[PDB]
Design a protein around this ligand. Structure first.
Ligand SMILES: CCCCCCCCCCCCCCCCCC(=O)OC[C@H](COP(=O)([O-])OCC(O)COP(=O)([O-])OC[C@@H](COC(=O)CCCCCCCCCCCCCCCCC)OC(=O)CCCCCCCCCCCCCCCCC)OC(=O)CCCCCCCCCCCCCCCCC
Ligand SMILES: CCCCCCCCCCCCCCCCC[C@@H](O)O[C@H](CO[C@H](O)CCCCCCCCCCCCCCC)COP(=O)(O)OCC[N+](C)(C)C
Ligand SMILES: CCCCCCCCCCCCCCCCC[C@@H](O)O[C@H](CO[C@H](O)CCCCCCCCCCCCCCC)COP(=O)(O)OCC[N+](C)(C)C
Ligand SMILES: CCCCCCCC/C=C\CCCCCCCC(=O)OC[C@H](COP(=O)(O)OCCN)OC(=O)CCCCCCC/C=C\CCCCCCCC
Ligand SMILES: CCCCCCCC/C=C\CCCCCCCC(=O)O[C@H](COC(=O)CCCCCCC/C=C/CCCCCCCC)COP(=O)(O)OCCN
Ligand SMILES: CCCCCCCC/C=C\CCCCCCCC(=O)O[C@H](COC(=O)CCCCCCC/C=C/CCCCCCCC)COP(=O)(O)OCCN
Lengths: 113, 347, 171, 126, 99, 83, 97, 105, 303
C-alpha cells in the first residue's frame, strides 16, 4: 500500500528531474539557433530588397512597352495619395510571369510537407 | 426552478445587458447579446407548459437569426474598414443589415410578429421582464450609431410600428397581447426620434418602462389575464381598478398625465427639423391606442360587471406578498409632467 | 497620383554571395562576430528610412563584408569548414548539436589562424549602438499637416439666462 | 484559381442543404460544405483554424445534430510579401488569448457554465 | 498537394476494394429469394458538446506557455479548468449523470 | 479538528479517486506561487530572441549600450548556462 | 473579390433557406449552423489576409458561442417533439397574433 | 446607452483588440499598419464630422491598402492589354517573364 | 516517387491487419490451453488468405429495402480514415510532415463516428439503431478524455509536431514523467475501438473489420510514439524503425491479452467509469501538468 505509492511518487520525481534538465538544455539550443538566424538576417534583408526592386523595375519596363498606345495611361503611376514607400502585393511582382512560379510563390510553403 | 438558479439566471441576463452597454468592441457587444439570449430562455420557461415552451422556441429562433445578421454586419464593416470599435458604420450595406437585426431584436415592424405570441405564451412576470428589460441593449446600440442610420428606413419602420400596434390592439381581449401591441407602438415612437435626438429616445424609454412596470404589477396583484377576469376586480379591490384606470389614461398620452411628456417632446423635436407631416400622423395613430385603453377602462372600473358567488370567500383573505415600488411606479407614471424640464439631466 | 521612382537595374548589381544555407549556418556565429558593423549600419538605416531604395549602398557594403569574410575563411580554414558544413547539410533540421566535434575543429582552426573567438550565448541578440553620419530622417512617414484642434472654450460657469426657457417653465 | 473552385463547391453544397430535404440528407450536405470550407481555410494558410473547424464543428456539433436526428424518425494576388519569422502568426495570435484576452476568457467561461445550467434546467421537464 | 494526392489515393483504393467486394459475388446465379426517445442519450450528447467547446478553449495551451506573462496565463488556464470542473460537478450533483 | 480528520479518513475510503483529484488540483493551484523557479521560467522566456534586435543610433550618451556583441555591456546569459 | 462574394452568397442562401420554413425545425437549426459556418470562414479569411494577429482569437470565440446556442436550440426542439411526437413547424400554432 | 466604465476606471477591458496598430504579440505588424496609424493620427481629437471631411485622403489610402481595388484594376488592365497584343501578334514576353531568366539569391 | 511511398505505406498496413487476425487467434488459443489455426498453412500462415477468399466469394445480404447510399458510403469512410491516420506518423520520418499532426489525428478520430451513425441509420432496424446510438455515445465520451490527456502530455513537448516527440524522449520515456495519464490513455484507446472489456456491440463487413483492426494497430503505434520514445540516429533510421515496430507489437499483444483476461462492463458501468473516475482525475492532472513546467522552469523550447 504505502510502498506502491512511494515507488510511483519516486519514478514521477525522477522523470520530472530528467525532463527539467533536458528541457533547459533544449532552451539553450533554441537560443543558439535563433542567434545564428539573427546573425544571418541582414544579408537576407539586403538580398530580398534587391530582388524586389529588380522585379518591380522589370515589370515597369514591360508595362512601358505594352501600354505605349493606350491614350490615357501613365506609366508607373501610383494608386496612393502618399509618396511613402508601400510594400508590394504578390500580384504586383508576379503578375506578368508564368503560372508555375506564380503558384510556387503563392502556395509553396503551404503545400510543402 | 431553484431560487439560487433563478437569481443566477436573472443576474446573467442583467450582466449580458450591461456588457452590451459598457463595451466598445463589436465582438463584446455580440457576446453580451449571446449571454442575454442564453440566460433569457429558462426565465420564459420557468412555469413548464406547452405554451411556454412554444413561446421560448419562437423567441430563440427570432433572436438567433437577429444575432447571426448582427455578426454578418460586424464582419462586413470590418472587411470594408479594419475597425472593431462601435462608431460610424463605414458601409451602407452593413448598416442596413445592422439596423434590420436590431429592429428584429426590438420587435419593430415588420419584425413585430413574435412579440404578441411570446407575450401571450409566457407568464406575467416573464412578460414584464421581456417588455421592460429586453429593450435596453438594442436601443443603446442604436443610440451609439444614430449618426449613421439612414433616416428613411428608420422612419418607415417606426411609422409602421405605430400603425401596426394601433391596429392590432383594437382586436384583443387578452391583456398580454394588448401589452405587446402597446409595446410595439411605443417602440415605434421611440425609434422615430433617434435620427434627431437620442435624449428624447431615452426619455421615452424611461417613461414607457415606468408605465409598463406599473401596469404589469397591477395585473399581477389582481391576477387577471383576460378582460372578463379583470372585470371582476372591482368586487374585491376597487382601489386597484381605480389606480389602473388612471394609469391607462396616462398610457394613452392624455395630459396632464406623465404619458403626455414623451410624445409632446418628440413632436417638438421633430418640428425643429422641419418635419411636420410625420408627427401629425403619429398622434392621429396614437389615438387608436388611446381607444383600446379606454375600452379596457370601461370594462374595468368605470362600470360594474356581474360577479360570482364564490367571490365572497375571497373577501376574507389578504394578499400575502406585497410588491415594493408599485406605489412609486404609479406616482411616477401619473404625476411627473410638472418636472418635465429635468430631461436636461440627459437621463 | 504621382510616379513611383525605382532605381535602374544597374543600381541593383552586386557580387552575390553564392553559398547555400548550410554553409551560411556553419559560419553564422563568426560571421556575426566579424561583420557586425556594416550589418548594424544597414539594419539601422533600413529601420529608420523604411524604404528599400534608400539603403542600397549599405546593402552593397554588407555583401562586400561577407565576401571578405568568406575569402579569409577560404584562404585559411578550408577543409575543417568543409567538414563542418557537410555535417550541417546532412541534417534535415541543420542542427548544431549532432557533430559538435567538427565544430570544435573549425573553432580551433580559426583561433589559430585569425584569432577569432566565437561569441557566447546571449551575445548576438544584444541591442547595440551604431555611430553613423547618415542624417536622421525628419518625416519618414511622409505625413501631411495635422488638422488644427477645436477651439477648446474655457471660462467661468454662470447660471442659465432665465433658466431652462422650456415653454412655460420659469425655472 | 483553386480557391475559386473550392468557393463554387461551397456555394453548391449550401444550395443543396438549404433546400432542406430529409434532414439527414441536409446534414450530409452541411457536412460536405463544412469540409470544403475547412479546405478553403487550410489552403489560405490558417492551419489551426481550419483544423478547429474540422474537429469542433464537424466532429462535435454536426455529430450531435446527426445523433439527435437519428433518435427521431482572381486569387493569389492579395497575398503578403514577407515571411513570419520563426513562428506562425496565427498560433501566436490564438495563444494571446491567455495573456491579452483575459476579459474574453472570463466572459466565455461564464457563458459556458451558464449554458450547462440552462440545458439542465430546460431538459428537467416536470 | 501531397496531402491532396494522399487523400485521393486512400479514397480511391477504399472505393475500388469495396466495389469489387460488393460486385464479385453478384455475378454468379443464386436463389435471390421506435417511440421511446431516451432523454439520457440526448443529455450525454449535449454534455459531450459543451465539454468539447471547453476543450476547444483549452487547446492553445502548448503555445500559451511562452508569453513572459506567465502568472496571468497560468491564472487564466487554471480558471478555465476550474470552471470545467465546476460544470462537471454541477451536472453530477443535480442527477445529470445517472442511468 | 476531529470532524475534519474523520471526514478525510472516510473519504479516503470508498472515494479515493476524488480525494486524489482534489489533492492534485489544490497542489497545482498552490505550489506555483511558492516555487522560486517560476521567476526563472519568466526570465528564460524573456531571453528567447524571436525578433531582430534593432540597433540604436549612438549619440555619445549611452554608455550602458554596447557597440559590439562581445562588449561587456548589456544583459548576460551566464546564469542560464549555470542552470 | 470573387472568393468573398461566394462566401457572402452562401450566407444569403442559408438565411433564405432558414426563412423558407418548409417543415422540420431541425432544418431551421441546420440553416442557422450553415450561416454561422459561413461567418466563420469569412471572418477567418479577412483576419488572415490583413495579418491582424490579435484578432485570431475572434473566430474561435464565435464558434464556441454559436455551438452553445446550437445546443440550446436542440434542447428546445427535443422538448417540442416530446409534446407532439414530431418536430413539425405547423404544430407550433397554439399562440397566434 | 454607452457607459464608459473602462475610461472612468482606466481598465482596458477590450481596447487592446480594436485596431491593427495596437501592440501585437511579438511586435508583429499589421499589413496596413502605417496607413491606419496615419489615419488615426489625422482624425484624433477632431470629431467624427470633421474627421470624415478633412481626413479623407488618409482613409482612402487605408481602404486602398485594405482591399487593393485600384491595384487589382490596374493589373487587370495591363494583363488584358498584354493578352490582346499577344493575340494580335505584336508583343512578345522577354525571357525573364518566360522562366528563362537567371535567378538571384 | 511519392506514389510509391504512398503505396508502400498503404499495402503493408493491410497485410499487417490481415495477419493480426491469425496472431490474435493463436495468442488466445495458447492462453486458453489450446492451439490456434495450425492446419491451413505450415503454422496457420495461410489462414488469413483463406478467410479473405471465402469472405470475398460469399453472397452479400443486402437488406433489399435500405438506403444504398449511406450503406455503401459508411465502409468507404471507415477504411479511408483508417488509412489516412497513418500518414503523419514518424517512423522516424513521416510521409507527410505536419506542424499540427496530433490535432490532425484528433480530427480524423472525431470523424470516425460518422460510419457508426450512418451504418446504424441505414440498417433499417430499431435495435441496430439503438446499438449504434449507444456506441456513438461511448465513443464521444471517451474521445473527450483522450483529447484532454493528449493536450496534457503535449504540454511537455512544446508543439503538436509528432517528430518533436522523438526529441522530447531522447533520454527518458514519457511513461516515467506521467504514468497515470498513460494508464487512462490506454484504457481510453481500448474504449475508443470497442475492444474488450468494452466490446458492447460479407464484403462490406470485411471492410469494416479491416478498418477496425487498422485503427487498433494505429492507436498502439501512436501510444508507443507518445509514451515509449525510441532513440533515433540520423545515420541509421532502421534502428528506430525496429524499436518502434517492436513496441507497437508489444502493445497490440497487450490488447489481445486484456481481451483474453477480463469480463466485460455494462453500458452504464463504463459511462460511470469515464464520467466519474477518468474525467476528474484527468482534469486534476491537466492542472498539474499546466503548473509543473512553470514551477520547475522546464518549459519546452518551441513556440
Ligand atoms: C429602469 C430599468 C428597469 C427595467 C425592468 C426592471 C427589471 C425587473 C425584474 C428584476 C427581477 C424580477 C422581479 O423582481 O419580479 C418583479 C417584481 C414583482 O415581484 P414578484 O412578482 O412578487 O416576484 C415574483 C418572482 O418571479 C418569484 O421568483 P423567486 O421567488 O424565486 O425570487 C427569488 C428572490 C430571492 O433571491 C434569493 O434567494 C437570494 C439568494 C442569493 C443567491 C446567490 C447567487 C449568487 C451566485 O430573488 C429575486 O427575486 C430576483 C432578484 C435578482 C437580483 C437582481 C440584482 O417587480 C419588480 O421587481 C419591479 C422592479 C422595479 C424596477 C427596478 C428598480 C427601479 C429602478
Ligand atoms: C418617470 C421618470 C423616470 C424615472 C427614472 C427612475 C428614477 C430612480 C433612479 C435613481 C437615480 C439614477 C441615477 C444614477 C446615479 C448616478 C448616475 C451617473 O453616474 O450617471 C450619469 C447619468 O445620470 C443619469 O443620466 C441621470 C438620471 C436622472 C433621471 C431623471 C430624468 C427624468 C425626466 C423628467 C421627468 C421627471 C422625473 C422626476 C421624478 C423622479 C452620467 O451619465 P454618462 O455616463 O456620462 O452618459 C451616459 C448617458 N447618456 C448616453 C444618455 C449621455
Ligand atoms: C472593479 C470592480 C470589482 C467588483 C465587480 C466585478 C464585476 C463582475 C466580475 C468581472 C470583472 C473582471 C475583473 C478582471 C478584468 C480583466 C483585466 C485585469 O484582470 O487585468 C488582467 C490581469 O489578469 C488577472 O490576473 C486576471 C484575474 C481575474 C480572474 C480570477 C477570477 C475571475 C472571476 C470574475 C467573475 C466571473 C464568474 C465568477 C467565478 C467565481 C490583464 O493582465 P496584464 O498582463 O497586466 O495585461 C495584459 C496585456 N499585456 C499582455 C499587454 C500585458
Ligand atoms: C480530410 C483531411 C482534411 C485536412 C487535411 C490536411 C490537414 C493539414 O493540416 O495539412 C495542411 C497542409 C500542411 O500544412 P501545415 O501542417 O500547416 O504545414 C505546412 C507548412 N510547413 O497544407 C495545406 O493546407 C494543403 C491542404 C489544403 C487543401 C485541401 C484541404 C482538404 C479539402 C477537403 C475538401 C473535401 C471535404 C469533403 C467533406 C469532408 C467530410 C468528412
Ligand atoms: C480546490 C481545488 C479544486 C480544483 C481541483 C478539481 C479537480 C477535478 C475535481 C472536480 C471534478 C468534479 C467533482 C464533483 C464532485 C461530486 C461529489 C459527489 O457528489 O460524489 C458523491 C460521493 O462523494 C462524496 O462523498 C462527496 C465528496 C467527498 C470528498 C471528496 C474529497 C474532498 C477533499 C479531500 C482532499 C482534500 C485535500 C487533500 C490533501 C491531502 C494531502 C496532500 C456521490 O457519489 P455517487 O456517484 O452518487 O456514489 C455514491 C454511492 N456509491
Ligand atoms: C507531489 C506530486 C503529485 C503527483 C500527482 C500524481 C499522483 C498519482 C496518484 C495516483 C494516480 C493513479 C491514477 C491512475 C488511473 C486511476 C483510474 C481509476 O482508478 O479508475 C478505477 C477503475 O479503473 C479501471 O479499473 C479500468 C480498468 C479496465 C480494465 C482494462 C485492463 C486494465 C489493466 C491492464 C493494465 C493496463 C496498463 C496500462 C499501461 C499503459 C502503457 C502505455 C476506479 O474504478 P472503481 O474501482 O469502480 O471505483 C470508482 C467507483 N466508485
Amino acid at each position: 500500500g504505502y510502498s506502491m505509492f512511494a515507488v510511483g511518487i519516486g519514478t514521477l520525481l525522477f522523470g520530472y528531474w530528467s525532463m527539467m534538465k533536458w528541457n533547459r538544455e533544449r532552451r539553450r539550443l533554441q537560443i543558439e539557433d535563433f542567434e545564428a538566424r539573427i546573425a544571418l538576417m541582414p544579408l537576407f534583408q539586403a538580398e530580398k530588397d534587391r530582388r524586389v526592386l529588380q522585379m518591380l523595375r522589370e515589370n515597369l519596363e514591360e508595362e512601358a512597352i505594352i501600354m505605349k498606345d493606350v491614350p490615357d495611361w501613365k506609366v508607373g503611376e501610383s494608386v496612393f495619395h502618399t509618396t511613402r514607400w508601400v510594400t508590394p502585393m504578390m500580384g504586383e511582382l508576379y503578375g506578368l510571369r508564368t503560372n508555375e512560379e506564380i503558384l510556387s510563390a503563392t502556395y509553396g510553403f503551404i503545400w510543402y510537407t | 426552478m431553484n431560487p439560487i438558479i433563478y437569481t443566477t439566471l436573472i443576474m446573467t441576463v442583467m450582466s449580458g445587458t450591461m456588457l452590451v452597454m459598457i463595451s466598445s468592441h463589436w465582438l463584446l457587444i455580440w457576446i453580451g447579446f449571446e449571454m442575454n439570449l442564453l440566460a433569457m430562455i429558462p426565465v420564459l420557461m420557468k412555469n413548464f407548459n406547452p405554451r411556454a415552451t412554444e413561446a421560448a422556441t419562437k423567441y430563440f429562433l427570432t433572436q438567433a437569426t437577429a444575432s447571426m445578421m448582427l455578426m454578418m454586419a460586424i464582419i462586413i464593416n470590418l472587411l470594408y474598414s479594419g475597425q472593431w470599435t462601435i462608431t460610424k458604420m463605414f458601409n451602407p450595406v452593413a448598416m442596413t443589415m445592422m439596423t434590420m437585426a436590431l429592429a428584429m431584436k426590438l420587435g419593430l415592424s415588420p419584425f413585430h410578429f413574435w412579440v404578441p405570441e411570446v407575450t401571450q405564451g409566457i407568464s406575467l412576470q416573464a412578460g414584464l421582464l421581456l417588455l421592460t428589460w429586453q429593450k435596453l441593449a438594442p436601443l443603446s446600440v442604436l443610440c451609439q450609431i444614430s449618426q449613421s442610420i439612414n433616416p428613411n428606413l428608420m422612419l418607415t419602420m417606426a411609422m409602421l410600428s405605430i400603425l401596426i400596434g394601433g391596429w392590432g390592439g383594437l382586436n384583443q381581449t387578452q391583456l398580454r397581447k394588448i401589452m405587446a401591441y402597446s409595446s410595439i407602438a411605443h417602440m415605434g415612437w421611440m425609434t422615430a426620434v433617434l435620427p434627431y435626438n437620442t435624449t428624447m429616445t431615452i426619455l421615452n424609454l424611461l417613461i414607457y418602462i415606468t408605465m409598463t412596470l406599473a401596469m404589469f404589477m397591477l395585473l399581477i396583484h389582481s391576477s387577471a389575464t383576460t378582460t372578463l377576469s379583470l372585470s371582476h376586480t372591482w368586487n374585491k379591490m376597487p382601489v386597484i381598478t381605480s389606480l389602473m384606470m388612471v394609469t391607462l389614461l396616462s398610457m394613452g398620452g392624455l395630459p396632464p398625465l406623465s404619458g403626455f411628456m414623451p410624445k409632446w417632446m418628440i413632436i417638438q423635436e421633430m418640428t425643429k427639423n422641419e418635419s411636420i407631416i410625420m408627427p401629425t400622423l403619429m398622434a392621429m395613430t396614437a389615438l387608436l391606442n388611446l381607444y383600446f385603453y379606454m375600452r379596457l377602462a370601461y370594462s374595468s372600473s368605470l362600470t360594474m360587471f356581474p360577479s360570482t358567488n364564490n367571490m365572497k370567500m375571497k373577501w376574507q383573505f389578504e394578499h400575502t406578498k406585497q410588491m415594493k415600488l408599485l406605489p412609486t411606479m404609479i406616482v411616477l407614471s401619473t404625476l411627473v409632467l410638472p418636472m418635465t424640464p429635468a430631461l436636461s439631466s440627459l437621463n | 497620383p504621382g510616379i513611383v521612382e525605382l532605381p535602374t537595374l544597374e543600381d541593383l548589381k552586386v557580387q552575390e554571395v553564392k553559398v547555400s544555407s548550410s554553409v551560411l549556418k556553419a559560419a553564422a556565429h563568426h560571421y556575426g562576430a566579424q561583420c557586425d558593423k556594416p550589418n548594424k549600419e544597414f539594419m539601422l538605416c533600413r529601420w529608420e528610412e523604411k524604404d528599400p531604395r534608400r539603403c542600397l549602398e549599405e546593402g552593397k557594403l554588407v555583401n562586400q563584408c561577407a565576401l571578405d569574410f568568406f575569402r579569409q575563411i577560404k584562404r585559411h580554414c578550408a577543409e575543417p569548414f568543409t567538414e563542418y558544413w557537410t555535417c550541417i547539410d546532412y541534417s534535415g533540421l541543420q542542427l548544431f548539436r549532432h557533430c559538435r566535434k567538427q565544430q570544435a575543429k573549425f573553432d580551433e582552426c580559426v583561433l589559430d589562424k585569425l584569432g577569432w573567438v566565437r561569441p557566447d550565448l546571449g551575445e548576438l541578440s544584444k541591442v547595440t549602438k551604431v555611430k553613423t553620419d547618415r542624417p536622421l530622417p525628419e518625416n519618414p512617414y511622409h505625413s501631411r499637416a495635422r488638422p488644427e484642434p477645436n477651439p477648446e472654450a474655457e471660462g467661468d460657469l454662470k447660471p442659465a439666462k432665465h433658466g431652462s426657457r422650456l415653454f412655460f417653465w420659469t425655472m | 484559381y483553386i480557391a475559386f473552385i473550392l468557393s463554387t463547391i461551397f456555394v453548391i453544397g449550401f444550395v443543396g442543404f438549404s433546400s432542406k430535404p430529409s434532414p439527414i440528407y441536409g446534414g450530409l450536405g452541411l457536412i460536405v460544405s463544412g469540409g470544403v470550407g475547412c479546405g478553403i481555410v487550410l489552403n489560405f494558410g490558417g492551419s489551426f483554424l481550419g483544423l478547429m473547424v474540422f474537429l469542433i464543428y464537424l466532429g462535435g456539433m454536426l455529430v450531435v445534430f446527426g445523433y439527435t436526428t437519428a433518435m427521431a424518425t482572381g486569387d493569389w494576388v492579395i497575398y503578403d510579401t514577407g515571411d513570419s519569422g520563426f513562428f506562425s502568426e496565427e498560433a501566436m495570435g490564438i495563444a494571446a488569448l491567455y495573456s491579452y484576452g483575459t476579459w474574453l476568457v472570463i466572459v466565455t467561461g461564464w457563458s459556458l457554465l451558464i449554458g450547462v445550467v440552462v440545458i439542465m434546467e430546460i431538459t428537467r421537464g416536470n | 498537394m501531397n496531402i491532396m494526392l494522399t487523400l485521393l489515393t486512400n479514397v480511391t483504393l477504399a472505393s475500388l476494394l469495396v466495389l469489387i467486394a460488393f460486385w464479385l459475388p453478384q455475378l454468379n446465379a443464386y436463389s435471390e429469394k421506435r417511440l421511446p426517445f431516451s432523454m439520457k442519450f440526448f443529455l450525454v450528447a449535449i454534455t459531450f458538446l459543451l465539454f468539447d467547446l471547453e476543450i476547444a478553449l483549452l487547446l492553445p495551451l502548448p503555445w500559451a506557455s511562452q508569453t513572459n506573462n506567465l502568472k496571468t496565463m497560468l491564472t487564466m488556464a487554471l480558471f478555465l479548468l476550474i470552471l470545467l470542473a465546476a460544470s462537471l460537478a454541477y451536472e453530477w450533483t443535480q442527477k445529470g449523470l445517472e442511468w | 479538528a476531529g470532524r475534519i480528520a474523520s471526514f478525510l479518513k472516510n473519504a479516503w475510503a470508498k472515494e479515493p479517486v476524488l480525494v486524489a483529484s482534489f489533492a492534485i488540483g489544490g497542489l497545482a493551484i498552490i505550489l506555483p506561487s511558492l516555487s522560486p523557479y517560476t521567476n526563472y521560467a519568466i526570465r528564460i522566456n524573456r531571453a528567447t530572441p524571436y525578433n531582430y534586435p534593432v540597433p540604436l543610433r549612438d549619440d555619445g550618451n549611452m554608455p550602458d549600450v554596447p557597440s559590439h556583441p562581445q562588449d561587456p555591456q548589456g544583459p548576460s546569459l551566464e546564469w542560464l548556462k549555470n542552470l | 473579390p470573387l472568393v468573398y462574394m461566394n462566401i457572402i452568397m452562401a450566407f444569403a442562401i442559408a438565411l433564405a433557406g432558414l426563412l423558407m420554413y418548409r417543415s422540420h425545425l431541425m432544418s431551421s437549426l441546420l440553416c442557422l449552423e450553415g450561416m454561422m459556418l459561413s461567418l466563420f470562414i469569412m471572418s477567418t479569411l479577412i483576419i488572415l489576409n490583413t495579418h491582424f494577429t490579435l484578432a485570431n482569437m475572434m473566430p474561435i470565440i464565435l464558434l464556441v458561442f454559436a455551438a452553445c446556442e446550437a445546443a440550446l436550440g436542440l434542447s428546445l426542439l427535443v422538448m417540442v417533439s416530446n409534446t407532439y411526437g414530431t418536430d413539425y413547424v405547423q404544430n407550433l400554432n397554439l399562440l397566434q397574433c | 446607452p454607452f457607459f464608459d466604465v473602462q475610461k472612468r476606471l482606466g481598465l482596458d477591458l477590450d481596447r487592446w483588440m480594436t485596431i491593427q496598430s495596437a501592440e501585437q504579440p511579438h511586435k508583429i505588424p499589421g499589413r496596413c499598419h502605417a496607413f491606419e496609424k496615419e489615419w488615426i493620427e489625422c482624425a484624433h481629437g477632431i470629431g467624427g464630422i470633421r474627421a470624415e471631411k478633412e481626413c479623407k485622403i488618409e482613409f482612402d489610402d487605408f481602404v486602398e491598402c485594405l482591399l487593393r481595388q485600384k491595384t487589382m484594376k490596374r493589373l487587370s488592365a495591363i494583363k488584358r492589354q498584354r493578352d490582346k497584343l499577344i493575340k494580335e501578334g505584336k508583343y512578345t514576353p522577354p525571357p525573364h517573364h518566360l522562366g528563362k531568366e537567371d535567378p538571384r539569391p | 516517387m511519392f506514389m510509391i511511398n504512398i503505396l508502400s505505406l498503404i499495402i503493408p498496413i493491410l497485410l499487417a491487419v490481415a495477419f493480426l487476425t491469425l496472431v490474435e487467434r493463436k495468442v488466445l488459443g495458447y492462453m486458453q490451453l489450446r492451439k490456434g489455426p495450425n492446419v491451413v498453412g505450415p503454422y496457420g500462415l495461410l489462414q488469413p488468405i483463406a478467410d479473405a477468399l471465402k469472405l470475398f466469394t460469399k453472397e452479400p445480404l443486402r437488406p433489399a429495402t435500405s438506403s444504398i447510399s449511406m450503406f455503401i458510403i459508411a465502409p468507404i469512410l471507415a477504411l479511408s480514415l483508417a488509412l489516412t491516420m497513418w500518414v503523419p506518423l514518424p517512423m522516424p520520418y513521416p510521409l507527410i510532415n505536419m506542424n499540427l499532426g496530433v490535432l490532425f489525428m484528433l480530427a480524423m478520430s472525431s470523424l470516425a463516428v460518422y460510419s457508426i451513425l450512418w451504418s446504424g441509420w441505414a440498417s433499417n432496424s430499431k435495435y441496430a439503431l439503438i446499438g449504434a446510438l449507444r456506441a456513438v455515445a461511448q465513443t464521444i465520451s471517451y474521445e473527450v478524455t483522450l483529447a484532454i490527456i493528449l493536450l496534457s502530455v503535449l504540454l511537455m513537448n512544446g508543439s503538436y509536431t509528432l517528430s518533436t516527440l522523438i526529441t522530447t524522449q531522447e533520454h527518458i520515456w514519457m511513461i516515467f514523467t506521467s504514468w497515470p495519464l498513460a494508464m487512462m490513455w490506454f484504457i481510453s484507446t481500448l474504449a475508443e475501438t470497442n475492444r474488450a472489456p468494452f466490446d458492447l456491440t460479407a464484403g462490406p463487413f470485411a471492410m469494416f473489420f479491416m478498418a477496425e483492426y487498422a485503427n487498433i494497430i494505429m492507436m498502439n503505434a501512436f501510444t508507443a510514439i507518445l509514451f515509449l520514445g525510441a532513440s533515433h540516429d540520423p545515420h541509421t533510421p532502421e534502428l528506430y524503425t525496429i524499436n518502434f515496430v517492436l513496441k507497437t507489437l508489444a502493445l497490440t499483444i497487450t490488447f489481445l491479452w486484456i481481451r483474453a483476461s477480463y469480463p466485460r462492463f455494462r453500458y452504464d458501468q463504463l459511462m460511470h467509469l469515464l464520467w466519474k473516475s477518468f474525467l476528474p482525475l484527468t482534469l486534476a492532472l491537466c492542472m498539474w501538468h499546466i503548473s509543473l513546467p512553470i514551477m520547475t522552469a522546464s518549459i519546452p523550447p518551441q513556440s
